[PDB]
Amino acid sequence: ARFPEAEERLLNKKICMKCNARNAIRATRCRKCGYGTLRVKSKE
Amino acid sequence: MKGMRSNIPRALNAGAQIACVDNTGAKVVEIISVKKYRGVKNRMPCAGIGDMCVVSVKKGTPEMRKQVLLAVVVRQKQEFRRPDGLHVSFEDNAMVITDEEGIPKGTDIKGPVAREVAERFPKIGTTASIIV
Amino acid sequence: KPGSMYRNVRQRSFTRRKYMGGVPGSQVIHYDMGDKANTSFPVKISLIVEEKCQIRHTALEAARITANRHLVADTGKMGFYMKLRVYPHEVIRENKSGMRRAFGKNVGTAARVKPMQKIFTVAVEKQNFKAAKEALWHAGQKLPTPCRIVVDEGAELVQ
Amino acid sequence: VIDAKGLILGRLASSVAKQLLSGDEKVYIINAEQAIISGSRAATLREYRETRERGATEFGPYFPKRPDRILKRTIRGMLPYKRARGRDAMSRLKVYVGVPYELKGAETVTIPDADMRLLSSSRYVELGEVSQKMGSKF
C-alpha cells in the first residue's frame, strides 16, 4: 500500500553505492566511507 | 513429529534386514538410513517403532526388487514401556512399505502392530486388523 | 608476468639490437593522436613522472587507449592533439636448470624514464581544459609510477 | 596518606614508587577507584580487555579485577619487586577502595603533578568504570 508518509520516511533516502549504507537526501558523501557517488533508493 | 506417550528404544540398526509384512510384493528389506536423525561420530544410524526410514528391497517380485523406498517399523523385539508402567515386546521385527505422509501401499497387514504407530500414523491403524 | 617483476632500475641498459636476438614486437600502433595538422592550441599540459622506473609497452598502450577514449568522448575528434613521447628501447628477459646458466632470454620491451620527465602531452582550447585534466588523470592510473600533471603553456589563461 | 581523587594513574604511580624506593614510612592511597586514565573510551576498554584475558590457567598472567588491585599492580611494575629492595618497598604500600575506618579523617596530601585539570581535552575514563566493565563488585 503506497501512502505519502510511509514513502516519505521509508524509501526517500540515498544509498551508498559501495557499502550499501543509506544516507540523507541532500548529500553527496557517504557518512561512513565517504564514497563520492550516491544513488537513490529504488522506487516501484 | 507428534510426540508419543510411550518410550521406544532404538533397536534396529542401519544394516539390518527386516521382513516386510504387507501385500505390496516384497519380503525382505535393508535399512539404509533413518529420517530425522543427525547422529554423532562413529555411531551407526538406528531406528525404532514409528520411525520413517529409507530401505532397499532384497527379496521380492522382479519389478519391486532393486528399489529405494520409504517404510516404518511396526514391531520390534526390543522391549519398551507403557505410560502407566509395563513392558511390551514381540518375537520379530516388521516393517510396512508406505509413502512420505504415511499411506501404506499395501491394503492388508498381517499380524499385530504396536498401538503407538497406530496413534502416530492413523492410516496404519485403520489398515491393520489386530492391534495389541 | 606481474607488473613489479620488471619495474626497478638496478642493472645496466640492454638495448643493442644487433647483438641480442628474437625481440618480440610491440602493440602501440600510433604515437600521435588527434589533429596533427593543427598548431594553434593555446594550452599545453602534460603528464610527468615522479620516480625512475621501467614502463612496459602494454601499460603505455592501455594508458593511450583510455586517454584517447575519454578525450574523444568529451572534447571532440578535432579539439586536441595528444602525443606519446617515450618509445620502448629496452629489452626484457625472463629466465626459463635452476641457476645453472641462469642468463635469461628476450620476452619483451620496456621504456625507461627519469624523474620529472614528460610522458604525455595534450593541447586543447580554453573551454576543454577540465576535460583534458580528467582524461590525463585516468591515463596515469594504468601507469606503474606516481604521476602529477603540469600545465606547461597558457598557465595564466587557465590559472 | 594520599587521596587518589582525580589524579592521573601513571603519574601518581611513578611519584609513589620513587618516594617508596627512597626509604621512609609506609604510604596509603585512599579512594583508588576514581583515578583518571586519559585516552578514548573504546581504546582503554579494548586494551584492558586484552590484558584481562591473556594467560594460561596453571602459570599464565593473572591480571586482577578489583580497582585497588589494579592500582597496586600498576605500581608493582615501576619497581624491582624481585629484588630485596623492591620486596621491602612493596611491603609498605596499601591502596584502599573507598576510605578504611582507621584512616578515617586522616590528614591528606596530593601529587600536584598528576591533576586532571592539567589535561587538554575531556577524553578520559575513571578507574571504577573499567573495574565494573571487567566484572567486579566493589
Partner: protein
Amino acid sequence: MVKEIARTIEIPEGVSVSLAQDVFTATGPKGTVERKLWYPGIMIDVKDGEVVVDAEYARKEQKAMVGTFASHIRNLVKGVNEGFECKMSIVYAHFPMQVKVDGKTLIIGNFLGEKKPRFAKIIGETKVKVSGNDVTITGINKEDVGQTAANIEQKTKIKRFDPRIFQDGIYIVQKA
C-alpha cells in the same frame, strides 16, 4: 573580516537561568529544565537576559563547540518558555491497531497480526495523547520529545518484507 568566536543568546523574560558549578539551570512558566555544558576552552557567562559564550583559539573545533553550546542554550530557554510538540500519524491496511497509553509506555496491539504487543518507552515527562490516526507529543525538553518520537517510530517497523508493499506503523509528519 574577523573570526571572533563569541556568541550571544539574549535570554527572554521568565526564565531564571544559572550556571552553578557546571549544570545550567533554568525555570519558567512551563516547569524547569536542567543540562550540563562543561567543555575545556569554552567559557560561558549568564548576565542581563543573555548568556555570552566564547572560546580562545580559532581552531575549527572550538568554533563548532561554541555553536553547539549556543544552540543548546537557545533550545533550553525556548522549551522552558512555551514547550515543544511533535506530530505523528497512523497507517494500516488490514489489521486495525489499538494504541493505548498505560503507565510510562505506549503499547501497540494487533500490529500486522501480532499476539505479543510491542512496547515503546516514554522518556521524561513527555505527555503523549492518542486520537484516531494521529499522535501528539507534548513536552518542555526538546531532546526528550525527539527521543520519545524516535522510539515510537522504531518499535513499529516490520523487518522481514518489502517497503513497497508493506507500509505500516507510526510516522512523523512534522518534527518537534
